[PDB]
Amino acid sequence: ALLSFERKYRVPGGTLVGGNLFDFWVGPFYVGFFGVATFFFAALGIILIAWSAVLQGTWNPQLISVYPPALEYGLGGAPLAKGGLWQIITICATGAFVSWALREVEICRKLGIGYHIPFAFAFAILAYLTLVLFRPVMMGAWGYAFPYGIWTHLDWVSNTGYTYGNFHYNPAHMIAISFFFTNALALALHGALVLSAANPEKGKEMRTPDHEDTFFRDLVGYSIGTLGIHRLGLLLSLSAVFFSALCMIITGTIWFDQWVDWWQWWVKLPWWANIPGGING
Amino acid sequence: DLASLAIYSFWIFLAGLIYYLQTENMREGYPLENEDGTPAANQGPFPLPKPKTFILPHGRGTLTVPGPESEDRPIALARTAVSEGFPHAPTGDPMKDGVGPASWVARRDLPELDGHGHNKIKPMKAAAGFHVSAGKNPIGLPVRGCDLEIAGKVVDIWVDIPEQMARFLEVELKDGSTRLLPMQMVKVQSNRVHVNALSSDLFAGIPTIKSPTEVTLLEEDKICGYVAGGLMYAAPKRKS
Amino acid sequence: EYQNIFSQVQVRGPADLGMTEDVNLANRSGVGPFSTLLGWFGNAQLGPIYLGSLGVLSLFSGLMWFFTIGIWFWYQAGWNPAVFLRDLFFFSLEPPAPEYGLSFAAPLKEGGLWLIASFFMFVAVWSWWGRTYLRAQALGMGKHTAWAFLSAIWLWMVLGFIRPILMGSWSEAVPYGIFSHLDWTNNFSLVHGNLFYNPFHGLSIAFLXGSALLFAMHGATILAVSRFGGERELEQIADRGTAAERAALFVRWTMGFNATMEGIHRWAIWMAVLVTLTGGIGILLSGTVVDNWYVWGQNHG
Numbered sequence: 031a032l033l034s035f036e037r038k039y040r041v042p043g044g045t046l047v048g049g050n051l052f053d054f055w056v057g058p059f060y061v062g063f064f065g066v067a068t069f070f071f072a073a074l075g076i077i078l079i080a081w082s083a084v085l086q087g088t089w090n091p092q093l094i095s096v097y098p099p100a101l102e103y104g105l106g107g108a109p110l111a112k113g114g115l116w117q118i119i120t121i122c123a124t125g126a127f128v129s130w131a132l133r134e135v136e137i138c139r140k141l142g143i144g145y146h147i148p149f150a151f152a153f154a155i156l157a158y159l160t161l162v163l164f165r166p167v168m169m170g171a172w173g174y175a176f177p178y179g180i181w182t183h184l185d186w187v188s189n190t191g192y193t194y195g196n197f198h199y200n201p202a203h204m205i206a207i208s209f210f211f212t213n214a215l216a217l218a219l220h221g222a223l224v225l226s227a228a229n230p231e232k233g234k235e236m237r238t239p240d241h242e243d244t245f246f247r248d249l250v251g252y253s254i255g256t257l258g259i260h261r262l263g264l265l266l267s268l269s270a271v272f273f274s275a276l277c278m279i280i281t282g283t284i285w286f287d288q289w290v291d292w293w294q295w296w297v298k299l300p301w302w303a304n305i306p307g308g309i310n311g
Numbered sequence: 312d313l314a315s316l317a318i319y320s321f322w323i324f325l326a327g328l329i330y331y332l333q334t335e336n337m338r339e340g341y342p343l344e345n346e347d348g349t350p351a352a353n354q355g356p357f358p359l360p361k362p363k364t365f366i367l368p369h370g371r372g373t374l375t376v377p378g379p380e381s382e383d384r385p386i387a388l389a390r391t392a393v394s395e396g397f398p399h400a401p402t403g404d405p406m407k408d409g410v411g412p413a414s415w416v417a418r419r420d421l422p423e424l425d426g427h428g429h430n431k432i433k434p435m436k437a438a439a440g441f442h443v444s445a446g447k448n449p450i451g452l453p454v455r456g457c458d459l460e461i462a463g464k465v466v467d468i469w470v471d472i473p474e475q476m477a478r479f480l481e482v483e484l485k486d487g488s489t490r491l492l493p494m495q496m497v498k499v500q501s502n503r504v505h506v507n508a509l510s511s512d513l514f515a516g517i518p519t520i521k522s523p524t525e526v527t528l529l530e531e532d533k534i535c536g537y538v539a540g541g542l543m544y545a546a547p548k549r550k551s
Numbered sequence: 552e553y554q555n556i557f558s559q560v561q562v563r564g565p566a567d568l569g570m571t572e573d574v575n576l577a578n579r580s581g582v583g584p585f586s587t588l589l590g591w592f593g594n595a596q597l598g599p600i601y602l603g604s605l606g607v608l609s610l611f612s613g614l615m616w617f618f619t620i621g622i623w624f625w626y627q628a629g630w631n632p633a634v635f636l637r638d639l640f641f642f643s644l645e646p647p648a649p650e651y652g653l654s655f656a657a658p659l660k661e662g663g664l665w666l667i668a669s670f671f672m673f674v675a676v677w678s679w680w681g682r683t684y685l686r687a688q689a690l691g692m693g694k695h696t697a698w699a700f701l702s703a704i705w706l707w708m709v710l711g712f713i714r715p716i717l718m719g720s721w722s723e724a725v726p727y728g729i730f731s732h733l734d735w736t737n738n739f740s741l742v743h744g745n746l747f748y749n750p751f752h753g754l755s756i757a758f759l760x761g762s763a764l765l766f767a768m769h770g771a772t773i774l775a776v777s778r779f780g781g782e783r784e785l786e787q788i789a790d791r792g793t794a795a796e797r798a799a800l801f802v803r804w805t806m807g808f809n810a811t812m813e814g815i816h817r818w819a820i821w822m823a824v825l826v827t828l829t830g831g832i833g834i835l836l837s838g839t840v841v842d843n844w845y846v847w848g849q850n851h852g
């Protein structure tokens with residue numbers, strides 16, 4: 031079934047691979063070559079997750095976990111039962127993620143729009159690959175990577191984090207946090223502003239961008255505008271993830287001591303390092 | 312305990328909230344249709360919402376949604392397969408016909424107004440006080456197609472007055488007529504404006520507007536659409 | 552292929568004094584300057600801002616809060632500008648000791664100040680809230696910004712006011728300090744038995760991360776369809792055009808469900824406000840009702 035305005039858009043073409051073979055929809059879903067790949071890597075990856083659950087001895091989803099190899103195996107392979115399944119599943123996860131991004135490109139071409147969405151999505155693939163691929167390789171084992179389980183992946187964050195003290199003190203963590211916070215502020219503001227102009231005081235006509243821009247200027251003296259806000263949101267959230275991967279690529283590779291102590295470079299600056307009083311000395 | 316209460320209450324409120332959100336996004340394009348335009352049998356899980364009515368400013372009537380959905384235009388397409396789910400090939404020139412990435416929508420054929428009821432977009436030559444403030448001024452530059460051939464010259468910028476941004480390049484063609492080019496679809500360079508989406512032979516094909524100083528919403532969609540369609544359809548004439 | 556992340560040309564006209572509606576124009580400033588730097592990303596125009604009684608009141612007490620904290624940072628630094636710049640992150644204005652409970656009888660050097668600056672902040676923020684409501688009312692707009700703002704006020708109120716009063720001591724509240732408010736956070740989690748077991752924490756994280764995903768998509772899409780005039784989120788509601796049609800079709804073809812131009816902004820406002828709404832409940836219940844989220848999690852309830 032089709033949206034009331036949709037038929038005029040379901041034209042042939044735009045594919046990257048395969049020509050007109052997978053150029054079709056199933057229900058609302060566009061397929062394409064990379065729809066097939068997505069479903070392949072996803073179906074294959076799901077099977078191995080259930081296989082991992084057979085060997086583990088549990089079907090409870092709050093207990094299924096698929097752990098990386100032990101540190102002992104370094105960056106080599108390991109038995110299916112002892113870390114190899116995470117290795118296959120991880121390859122599949124990547125396959126499914128990259129085919130998802132690529133399938134989105136194909137959807138974009140048919141529709142004649144910009145590629146901004148898969149581009150944004152590629153930053154999230156970056157983050158995933160930092161955690162399960164770039165950081166482990168540099169550190170020298172797959173063991174440094176996180177496990178595929180609901181609550182156990184949360185134990186990894188707590189344990190990785192707490193290994194360097196309070197992880198709060200990673201300076202890239204701090205920046206990454208800030209962008210994550212500002213994006214939510216900007217999202218609530220954008221959401222509220224559009225709705226407040228389309229949905230005014232009862233009985234009044236719809237407001238105009240004019241009203242939206244006047245509201246911001248009246249409130250903080252500056253209005254970024256309606257194109258600027260989407261520029262801003264795309265950019266805020268893409269930065270958040272970027273500094274996340276960054277705080278995490280430098281941890282255990284070029285900085286492995288405690289993160290609170292890194293700040294001592296500032297305090298030992300020589301022109302005040304030995305001045306007495308304050309908190310330090 | 313009290314926290315267990317808290318969290319069930321929340322997961323219930325969260326389930327009604329998603330239901331609300333889901334039905335609010337059914338206010339356009341519904342009910343679903345078969346590819347022949349009759350109503351589909353399977354309309355999905357949630358019902359349609361209680362219609363809402365917007366009051367359009369400036370005495371422009373109302374809009375009530377969900378409302379009756381007619382394309383109000385002709386669709387030049389034919390089926391390619393015997394079963395639902397495949398593409399629909401164009402039966403003419405998709406760029407002229409307005410299908411695929413060249414589609415437009417039958418929007419009001421009036422210009423969007425600002426908060427004061429004046430035309431929101433004016434050619435700069437009629438926008439008092441307006442000038443290029445930063446960046447390269449495109450006015451006067453020649454316009455180049457994706458086939459590396461020259462199609463026209465920029466003779467004005469069409470500007471959003473309340474938002475103070477450039478929105479169209481008014482391009483003059485060889486016969487003396489002009490056309491609007493979406494500003495998002497040109498690359499202004501030191502010695503030219505480059506248009507990746509159109510070869511030069513397709514510039515006269517850009518839809519024209521009916522008044523030299525105003526562009527209407529239909530007009531905006533037809534122009535904009537046609538330019539985007541060249542990305543797919545004018546590809547038999549493009550190099551790097 | 553130009554991407555629309557920066558403007559290629561900037562146009563300028565007269566400064567925009569703004570819509571009037573029921574606004575008292577005696578309280579709008581002169582238009583500030585025009586930033587060309589800002590003009591590549593958004594609007595070049597700075598000002599005019601609107602200041603009334605609530606504006607001054609908020610801005611006044613907003614500074615009084617800020618100054619109190621920084622006055623105590625100099626006293627901590629022993630007035631040496633060099634010490635100040637060095638230990639700036641390390642200074643901290645702390646709430647009264649537990650001994651003083653909820654009384655205001657605390658000495659200046661041991662709380663009291665924190666209570667002064669806390670009160671000034673409390674006046675500044677609520678002032679500013681009423682300002683967002685009253686600014687919308689003047690333009691005849693909905694009060695969505697003010698209700699959404701209330702959800703951030705929720706968490707803040709819980710962290711330093713509601714939860715301290717419920718615990719019975721001002722000491723439970725957050726201090727004023729860069730590195731010191733970080734430490735309060737870690738600690739809070741440790742004492743209550745790992746906040747990762749607080750289900751409102753894990754939900755509030757879901758919405759955090761989901762707001763980054765949503766604004767990532769919404770922004771990318773509107774840029775992807777600005778060639779059709781999509782950034783014009785509002786007239787596309789009054790009169791759906793092709794920008795709105797293809798933005799809907801991207802998400803239907805990718806992942807199967809529907810998004811209208813207005814409809815997707817309801818997702819935006821709720822995804823965002825749920826971060827602080829859920830989080831506030833999790834911090835409020837922590838230590839009032841629940842001592843140890845691991846132990847609570849063990850009984851699943």
Ligand code: BCL
Pocket residue numbers: 127154155157158160161186187188189190191192196197198203206207210271273274275276277278736
């Ligand atoms: C005790 C734990 C430590 C700590 C240790 C860590 C550690 C350790 C890490 C972080 C990381 C992060 N932390 Mg920290 N952190 C702490 C305290 C905090 C506080 C806080 C209030 O105190 C906050 C707000 C944060 C915030 C953050 C972010 C900066 C960052 C997570 C986002 C991210 O990477 O997204 C990136 C997004 C992804 C990786 C997801 C990608 C999704 C993929 C591409 C697609 C998946 C599809 C899925 C399978 C689809 C399936 C469903 C359907 C079938 C379709 N931390 C404490 C002090 N923090 C992480 C980071 O920076 O990672 C790079 C990290 O590794």
Ligand code: BCL
Pocket residue numbers: 076079158161176180181183184187752753754756757758760761764
């Ligand atoms: C990003 C930094 C850290 C990390 C730190 C945290 C912390 C801290 C928390 C979570 C939380 C969650 N994380 Mg984790 N998380 C990481 C990487 C991942 C990856 C991945 C890269 O593949 C995935 C799929 C998940 C998945 C999840 C969910 C179990 C949960 C809610 C996510 C959410 O709302 O997202 C935002 C996305 C949306 C709103 C869109 C919809 C996404 C749907 C719901 C995804 C479900 C995935 C499903 C359960 C598993 C995949 C299906 C497979 C076929 C098996 N995390 C890394 C290592 N994650 C929270 C939680 O409650 O966990 C118990 C939590 O507190």
Ligand code: BCL
Pocket residue numbers: 187211214676703704706707710735736737738739740745746747751752755756759826827829830831833834
């Ligand atoms: C080691 C530390 C603990 C931890 C302890 C805590 C504690 C403690 C808290 C959180 C909170 C949160 N944590 Mg946790 N958390 C950790 C691990 C994580 C990780 C992770 C490892 O990946 C992540 C992603 C998160 C994520 C989150 C957020 C979802 C949430 C804060 C929401 C927010 O927007 O606050 C930012 C917004 C505000 C605080 C509201 C501010 C509103 C006011 C009105 C602003 C006024 C500003 C004032 C006027 C100054 C203006 C100055 C200038 C004028 C500009 N936590 C570990 C487990 N976390 C909070 C929460 O809700 O928990 C449920 C919380 O209190």
Ligand SMILES: CC[C@H]1c2cc3[nH]c4c(c3C)C(=O)[C@H](C(=O)OC)c4c3nc(cc4[nH]c(cc(n2)[C@@H]1C)c(C(C)=O)c4C)[C@@H](C)[C@@H]3CCC(=O)OC/C=C(\C)CCC[C@H](C)CCC[C@H](C)CCCC(C)C
Pocket residue numbers: 068071072075076079119122123124126127130131134147148150151153154177178179180183267268271760761763764765767768771805806
């Ligand atoms: C970069 C900014 C933010 C962002 C953006 C973003 N995400 C996106 C997009 C964009 C722009 C999309 O276009 C795309 C999309 O379609 O969204 C609806 C997507 C998407 N973001 C998703 C999730 C997601 N995004 C996250 C984060 C973020 N996404 C960033 C914060 C997170 C977090 C914070 O943890 C998650 C979980 C999906 C909804 C979707 C991608 C769907 C996809 O790739 O589907 C193909 C794959 C499958 C259907 C399943 C494959 C299964 C595996 C082979 C087996 C499982 C392996 C996996 C490692 C198990 C892990 C689970 C445990 C860790 C619990």
Ligand SMILES: COC(C)(C)C/C=C/C(C)=C/C=C/C(C)=C/C=C/C(C)=C/C=C\C=C(C)\C=C\C=C(/C)CC/C=C(\C)CCC=C(C)C
Pocket residue numbers: 617618620621622624666669670672673707708709710711712725726727728729732
């Ligand atoms: C340059 O030097 C000068 C002196 C000029 C200026 C410098 C100033 C400086 C150095 C400022 C630095 C400020 C900093 C570092 C601020 C940090 C603030 C942070 C991180 C705050 C975090 C959280 C705060 C919270 C949660 C506060 C909550 C408060 C309330 C909810 C209200 C509290 C109300 C109370 C206690 C009751 C008050 C009394 C009555 C009767 C209502």
Ligand SMILES: CCCCCCCCCCCC[N+](C)(C)[O-]
Pocket residue numbers: 250251252580581582583584597598599600
């Ligand atoms: C988020 C803050 C945005 C910037 C706000 C500053 C702009 C204030 C402009 C007022 C200036 C008017 N004045 C006094 C110069 O005439």
Ligand SMILES: CCCCCCCCCCCC[N+](C)(C)[O-]
Pocket residue numbers: 446557558559588589591592
């Ligand atoms: C929120 C602050 C963001 C402001 C961004 C300022 C970036 C300047 C970009 C200049 C590049 C424009 N140009 C044409 C020179 O390329």
Ligand SMILES: [Cl-]
Pocket residue numbers: none
């Ligand atoms: Cl910043």
Ligand SMILES: [Fe+3]
Pocket residue numbers: 246252253254255
């Ligand atoms: Fe703004």
